[PDB]
RNA sequence: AAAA
RNA sequence: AAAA
């Protein structure tokens, strides 16, 4: 899915870090307009990431977009999820006018919010990830680099919410893995360039085919077979690895 | 699995037909001046690839027993089969009773009798084409891993599709099966509509048949930018598409079959 | 994609630097009028690079050209993107008249802008380039000099926005590389004279043919194949190199 | 790859035809007093170029099976083929049954038998021109890298064009393959319309067939300032133009195929 | 055939 | 044949 970030320049340090963590989870992140950019793709367009902070709400030009974003979210095109840089209690709610205060209280009452803090980085990042992926289909755990049996490999982990998906779910999915592959070693991307990529997690075989197929001539693809709980190679794009090698997981 | 053909031109009419049937079943076929740029002919063509090299096709016929040009070939083929490099499977063009055994010498007759007794054979008859073809295909696939039924040109829900059917003998395979397999599917797709090949050019291909996920991935992977790939899912029993290489075909729709 | 710079003589030092950096990215750049060559070429003419500066806004004989540029820009023949020498806050807007100030606010708000600073040169230049290539087809990263396996070489890096292009895209492209090859060692051009040039980056083979073909009898052409990740030489216009030699990654 | 033709004038009618067909397939065809500005006859031409020198096309025939002279060169070709510099592809103008073996001496007969059994040969018949021509083309291309089918002149969407087919045996080539290739396109480009050559002058040329991008670039690059170049992309199966050397043809248009 |  |  897509995810746009709305923020102030003061919290850029946190914004870039959360952006990097999200991009590590195979979600399209665009920062730099954003409101006319909303009407694009399918009804499953994206989710709005609003980063609420004390110096942030003092700017009206940081607020008109969110006002009209609520206006266009009531029609169901997009959904907003607010991020509290500071806790609810110490938010400067006095400075704003009456209408601003009521709209903010409505947005933090009728709409579920999650809180972010710098001290608990791991917990805050996990909470924003889960509260961001609560209303969506199969997840995508962040890429982890693990060296198995002397062979370097990066593994993408996905978990199915529930036990089944609609048979035509692939039609309405808006994620394609082609643009999430690094082209150069120096370039930063969710998937390391030329580094073997493995598939992990239970799921229907057609989703496995859809994930593995676009990787031709880009990276060698490993896949997990739970019958014996080991990795299996299907593509030989790097010398020294043949299709059929097994990695003791 | 490769297959080297030994025959005579008097049987070319049936050799071409059996070759076409085998090629429609995802099997590498090799006839006269064919491929393997090595020594060539056939006898030195045996020694290439993995221990699962091929299954010899000795098209025995009443007139085949002449022309020592082929009997020496069969002799060397069995000699190197005794080492286990290749396994011979004979095809009897005519029924066993009316083979002109008297024409052969004593040594040739003894060799042929030993071959036809120790080693199983397949009877072939022009009259019953489909049963003989099924018999020879099943005999070829008998001592092998997951089979491959002939590609079938079927029309589903208004869109044209070809399916590749594979059945697993038993219900499990060694986890390192893919290492020793001698089938590379990317060479069996035609580049032009008129060119004859196991897979029609640009026609969507669907994988059907129960099996492990890694086999499915290895089979759908080399098809990228060649043919739109459909996949059969047994949970609700309709084909599932994972490529958009042809106009009007998007990844995700269903074909109720 | 051509690029027309309208600016003042005061910031000419940074104008020339941004010009050189842009030219290094295979972007056609013209400086020395600017209003009437706008009608030339194809519908994709260029994007106007109007240099917004505090000294610039006091020059009405440089305001008029921007006015006519925007007047034509309603029709969509050209589009203007502004570069901010100073931060948006410290502009001298009060001395401006009512109509000109309103026009400046309209263009600054309804149209996205980008901010430049003399200190952080690298990130500012990267942002300028990204703003240039936002709405365009396949990108073009700046040419870099790398000696691979003891052989001098420059790589032309191009990135596909997304994973597919229109099949008839080549018809409407406004880039031919024949004008971007140096004819003399002294003459400064994006492609240095007689040195090997390589094409690196994923893309369809027809684009590779189009980008390699005009190079005949000009420079030895290298190419990168990602199957095993080494460069491949296809043309030998210089001694010591043969078609078929490899450069290890 | 090169091809040297050894024959007799009694078979010139078919020799010129097969040579023309071969030249249509982008292979170097050398005949008497025709090429090699650094030698003469046919024998010492072998010591030239790379280890992939050429394949000897010995046009065996009943009238050829004598012409004493021919033998000396046939013997030398075989003797230096034992070193592996050249290969011999014998062409039987007549079937081997009516080959007058009795006229030859014991040494010549023994040598002919040895070369006929140990080395693969191709039968040629006047009646089946297409099949025999395809067979000899396959004989040429069997022990080589990516092969070239004959150039076909086809009009697509009302636009004149020719296509150079090329198919890669197997699925991959050595990365350094381009170093050892003996095929350069420049030598096969016509200079005048009346001049006969594999590539017609100024006629648009289309590259079609699956292969690596570097091979595509190498095959298209020498075409600058000579002919308009078309490239086939399999994403939508349409021809794409990359050069505008003829009026009315801009780089970027598509040809529905 | 929903990690067989 | 969209870095095979
Ligand atoms: N396809 C055929 N073409 C020509 N003659 C044939 C063919 N099939 C059978 N015969 C005849 O039947 C006998 C076949 O033996 P022979 O071919 O002489 O010699 P070998 O056993 O060492 O095979 C040489 C190979 O090289 C070539 O590629 C051939 O096609 C072979 O595959 C002779 O009477 C043939 O004329
Ligand atoms: N290409 C040929 N053209 C004409 N006659 C030929 C040819 N090939 C064989 N013969 C006949 O084969 C017999 C033996 O002479 P030959 O094998 O020719 O000699 P060589 O290999 O030292 O080349 C000389 C050729 O080169 C010149 O270009 C001419 O064409 C010469 O023929 C004669 O009856 C020839 O007529």
Residue numbers in the entry:
A (entry chain A), C (entry chain C): 2 to 33, 42 to 258
B (entry chain B), D (entry chain D): 2 to 258
What do the study's own words say?
Here we investigated a protein containing a CARF domain fused Toll/interleukin-1 receptor (TIR) domain, Cat1. We found that Cat1 provides immunity by cleaving and depleting NAD+ molecules from the infected host, inducing a growth arrest that prevents viral propagation. Cat1 forms dimers that stack upon each other to generate long filaments that are maintained by bound cOA ligands, with stacked TIR domains forming the NAD+ cleavage catalytic sites. Further, Cat1 filaments assemble into unique trigonal and pentagonal networks that enhance NAD+ degradation.
To understand the effects of Cat1 filamentation on the catalysis of NAD+ cleavage at the atomic level, we solved cryo-EM structures of cA4-bound Cat1 in the presence of a non-hydrolysable NAD+ analogue, benzamide adenine dinucleotide (BAD) or NAD+ at 3.3 Å and 4 Å resolution, respectively. We could resolve similar pentameric filament network formation for class 1 that represented the largest number of particles for both cA4-BAD-Cat1-His6 and cA4-NAD+-Cat1-His6 and therefore these were processed further, to the exclusion of other classes in both complexes that were part of the same network. We modelled a pair of Cat1 dimers in the map for each structure. In the case of the cA4− NAD+-Cat1-His6 structure, the observed density was sufficient to model ADPR, but neither the NAD+ substrate nor the other reaction product, NAM. In both cases we observed that residues S7, H8, N9, N10, D33, S68 and E74 from one TIR domain, and K121 and Y122 from the other, line the NADase active site. The BB-loop is predicted to control the access to the NADase active site in other TIR proteins. Both structures revealed that the active site is formed by two TIR domains from a pair of stacked Cat1 dimeric repeat units, suggesting that the catalytic activity relies on the multimerization of Cat1 dimers upon cA4 signal recognition. We tested the importance of these residues for Cat1 activity by making alanine substitutions (N10A, D33A, S68A, E74A, K121A and Y122A). The mutants were tested in vivo by measuring their toxicity during the type III-A CRISPR-Cas response and were all found to be defective in causing a growth arrest in staphylococci. While the D33A substitution reduced activity only partially, the Y122A mutation completely abrogated NAD+ cleavage. Altogether these data showed that Cat1 active site is formed through the interaction of two stacked TIR domains from different dimers, a finding that provides an explanation for the importance of filamentation for its enzymatic activity, as well as for the cooperativity of NAD+ cleavage.
